Amino acid sequence: GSSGSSGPVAGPYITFTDAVNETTIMLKWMYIPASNNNTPIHGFYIYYRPTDSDNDSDYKKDMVEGDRYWHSISHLQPETSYDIKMQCFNEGGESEFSNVMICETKARSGPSSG
């Protein structure tokens, strides 16, 4: 077709963002084949970082099966509202950067409930 950037461009789109725990978060992404080149994906990368961070330098990367549309992040900060995003990749090349989803974790409660 065109000449420039090959691979899955459409990129995935996050349509679900919730906090499984004070240090855990569950987010699900969707795939739009319509505007896709029916190309096979290697997996799924997920970036995350606390708003307290300095720059992307913090943003991490979590690979996930290409057939997986769900991922539960861990080792996060409690009641910490930070931006979250993800992106897929394949032999062809990395896809576009998904949208920025703000998923606020749960409050780090104590042993005594109120």
Swiss-Prot record:
Q: In which tissues is it expressed?
A: Highly expressed in embryonic somites, limb buds, dermomyotomes and in the neural tube.
Q: Which residues are glycosylated?
A: N21, N55
Positions of the Fibronectin type-III domain: 8-108
Give compartment(s). Membrane
Q: Which domain of life is it from?
A: Eukaryota
Q: What induces it?
A: Up-regulated during early stages of myoblast differentiation.
Complexes and interactors:
Part of a complex that contains BOC, CDON, NEO1, cadherins and CTNNB1. Interacts with SHH, DHH and IHH. Interacts with NTN3. Interacts with CDH2 and CTNNB1. Interacts with CDH15 only during the early stages of myoblast differentiation.
Q: Function, please? A: Component of a cell-surface receptor complex that mediates cell-cell interactions between muscle precursor cells. Promotes differentiation of myogenic cells.
Q: What is the protein name for this chain?
A: Brother of CDO
Species whose genome carries this gene: Mus musculus
Identify the coding gene. Boc
